[PDB]
Amino acid sequence: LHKEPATLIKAIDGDTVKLMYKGQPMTFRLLLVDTPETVEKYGPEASAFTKKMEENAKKIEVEFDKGQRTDKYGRGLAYIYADGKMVNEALVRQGLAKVAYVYKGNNTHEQLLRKAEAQAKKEKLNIWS
């Protein structure tokens, strides 16, 4: 997998963000994460977390996996990086999201995320409170 540059347009919530990708605006859905919807418990926490991480970043990069690249709603399915730090992973590690079921072969980082989740659970962080 290879990372590509992107520019933040607008943070929508915990699991979705609008980015300028290859010259055009596009909505992306973060791969392998399930964040509380915004209003479920920790929903606003997850949203603020993602928003702060994305808006303060110098560089935003998108990384598509090896499976299908867009869901039924036209959203791109990818791992998002803020200054080299994967947002998908940070959310799970901080206990603000759970690892979702693999979707159409997009599982390159499933183990990485599963381990981050086990640690958040052991630390009883937020959702695991």
CSV table of C-alpha atoms in Angstrom, one decimal:
chain,number,residue,atom,x,y,z
A,1,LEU,CA,0.0,0.0,0.0
A,2,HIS,CA,1.2,3.6,-0.7
A,3,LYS,CA,0.2,6.9,0.9
A,4,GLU,CA,-1.1,9.7,-1.2
A,5,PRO,CA,-1.5,13.4,-0.3
A,6,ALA,CA,-4.8,15.0,0.5
A,7,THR,CA,-6.1,18.3,1.9
A,8,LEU,CA,-8.7,18.5,4.7
A,9,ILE,CA,-11.9,20.2,3.7
A,10,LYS,CA,-14.1,19.4,6.7
A,11,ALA,CA,-14.3,16.9,9.6
A,12,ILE,CA,-17.8,15.4,9.7
A,13,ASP,CA,-17.5,13.1,12.7
A,14,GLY,CA,-15.6,10.3,14.2
A,15,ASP,CA,-15.6,7.9,11.2
A,16,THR,CA,-16.0,10.2,8.2
A,17,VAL,CA,-14.0,13.2,6.8
A,18,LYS,CA,-14.2,15.3,3.6
A,19,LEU,CA,-11.0,15.7,1.8
A,20,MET,CA,-9.7,17.2,-1.4
A,21,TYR,CA,-8.2,14.1,-3.2
A,22,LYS,CA,-6.5,14.4,-6.5
A,23,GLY,CA,-8.1,17.7,-7.3
A,24,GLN,CA,-11.7,16.9,-6.2
A,25,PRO,CA,-13.6,16.9,-3.0
A,26,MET,CA,-14.5,13.5,-1.7
A,27,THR,CA,-15.9,11.9,1.5
A,28,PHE,CA,-13.9,9.2,3.1
A,29,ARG,CA,-15.0,6.6,5.6
A,30,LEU,CA,-12.2,5.4,8.0
A,31,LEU,CA,-11.4,1.7,7.5
A,32,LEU,CA,-11.9,-0.9,10.2
A,33,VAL,CA,-13.3,1.4,12.9
A,34,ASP,CA,-16.7,1.8,14.5
A,35,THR,CA,-17.1,5.1,16.3
A,36,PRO,CA,-20.2,6.1,18.4
A,37,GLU,CA,-22.5,8.1,16.1
A,38,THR,CA,-23.1,11.8,16.9
A,39,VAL,CA,-25.9,11.2,19.9
A,40,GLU,CA,-24.4,8.0,21.3
A,41,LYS,CA,-22.1,7.8,24.3
A,42,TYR,CA,-18.6,9.1,23.5
A,43,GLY,CA,-19.9,10.2,20.1
A,44,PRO,CA,-18.9,13.8,20.6
A,45,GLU,CA,-15.6,12.7,22.2
A,46,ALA,CA,-14.7,10.6,19.1
A,47,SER,CA,-15.7,13.4,16.8
A,48,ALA,CA,-13.7,16.1,18.6
A,49,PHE,CA,-10.7,13.8,18.7
A,50,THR,CA,-10.7,13.1,15.0
A,51,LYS,CA,-11.4,16.8,14.3
A,52,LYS,CA,-8.5,18.1,16.4
A,53,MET,CA,-6.1,15.5,15.0
A,54,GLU,CA,-7.0,16.4,11.4
A,55,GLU,CA,-7.3,20.2,11.6
A,56,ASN,CA,-4.0,20.6,13.4
A,57,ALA,CA,-2.0,18.3,11.1
A,58,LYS,CA,0.6,19.7,8.7
A,59,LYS,CA,0.1,16.8,6.3
A,60,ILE,CA,-2.8,14.5,5.7
A,61,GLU,CA,-2.4,11.4,3.7
A,62,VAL,CA,-4.8,8.7,2.5
A,63,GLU,CA,-4.0,5.1,2.1
A,64,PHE,CA,-6.4,2.8,0.2
A,65,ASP,CA,-6.3,-0.9,1.1
A,66,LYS,CA,-6.3,-3.8,-1.4
A,67,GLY,CA,-10.0,-4.4,-1.5
A,68,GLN,CA,-12.9,-2.3,-2.8
A,69,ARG,CA,-12.1,1.4,-2.5
A,70,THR,CA,-15.6,2.9,-2.1
A,71,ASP,CA,-18.7,1.8,-0.2
A,72,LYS,CA,-22.3,1.8,-1.5
A,73,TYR,CA,-22.7,5.5,-0.5
A,74,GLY,CA,-19.8,6.7,-2.7
A,75,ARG,CA,-17.4,7.2,0.3
A,76,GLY,CA,-13.7,6.3,-0.1
A,77,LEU,CA,-12.6,3.5,2.2
A,78,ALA,CA,-9.1,4.2,3.6
A,79,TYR,CA,-6.6,4.6,6.4
A,80,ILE,CA,-6.1,8.3,7.1
A,81,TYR,CA,-2.8,9.6,8.4
A,82,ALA,CA,-2.2,13.0,10.2
A,83,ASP,CA,1.5,13.9,10.2
A,84,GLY,CA,2.4,10.3,9.9
A,85,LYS,CA,0.1,9.1,12.7
A,86,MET,CA,-2.8,6.8,11.5
A,87,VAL,CA,-6.1,8.3,12.7
A,88,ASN,CA,-7.8,4.9,12.5
A,89,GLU,CA,-5.3,3.5,15.0
A,90,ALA,CA,-5.3,6.5,17.4
A,91,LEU,CA,-9.1,6.3,17.8
A,92,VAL,CA,-9.0,2.6,18.7
A,93,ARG,CA,-6.0,3.0,21.0
A,94,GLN,CA,-7.6,5.9,22.8
A,95,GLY,CA,-10.7,3.7,23.3
A,96,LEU,CA,-12.9,5.9,21.1
A,97,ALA,CA,-13.8,3.3,18.6
A,98,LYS,CA,-14.0,-0.5,18.2
A,99,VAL,CA,-12.4,-2.5,15.4
A,100,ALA,CA,-15.1,-3.2,12.8
A,101,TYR,CA,-15.6,-6.3,10.7
A,102,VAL,CA,-13.3,-6.6,7.6
A,103,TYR,CA,-15.0,-5.3,4.5
A,104,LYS,CA,-14.4,-6.7,1.0
A,105,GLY,CA,-10.8,-7.7,1.6
A,106,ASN,CA,-9.7,-4.5,3.2
A,107,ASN,CA,-7.7,-6.0,6.2
A,108,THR,CA,-4.1,-5.1,5.8
A,109,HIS,CA,-4.1,-3.3,9.2
A,110,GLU,CA,-6.6,-5.4,11.1
A,111,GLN,CA,-4.1,-7.0,13.4
A,112,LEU,CA,-2.5,-3.7,14.2
A,113,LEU,CA,-5.9,-2.3,15.2
A,114,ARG,CA,-6.9,-5.4,17.1
A,115,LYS,CA,-3.9,-5.1,19.3
A,116,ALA,CA,-4.5,-1.4,19.9
A,117,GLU,CA,-8.1,-2.3,20.9
A,118,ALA,CA,-7.0,-5.0,23.3
A,119,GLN,CA,-4.7,-2.5,25.1
A,120,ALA,CA,-7.5,0.1,25.3
A,121,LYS,CA,-9.7,-2.5,26.8
A,122,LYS,CA,-7.1,-3.6,29.3
A,123,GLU,CA,-6.7,0.1,30.3
A,124,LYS,CA,-10.5,0.5,30.5
A,125,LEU,CA,-10.3,3.7,28.4
A,126,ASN,CA,-13.5,5.6,27.6
A,127,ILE,CA,-15.8,3.2,25.7
A,128,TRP,CA,-14.3,0.4,27.8
A,129,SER,CA,-15.0,2.2,31.0
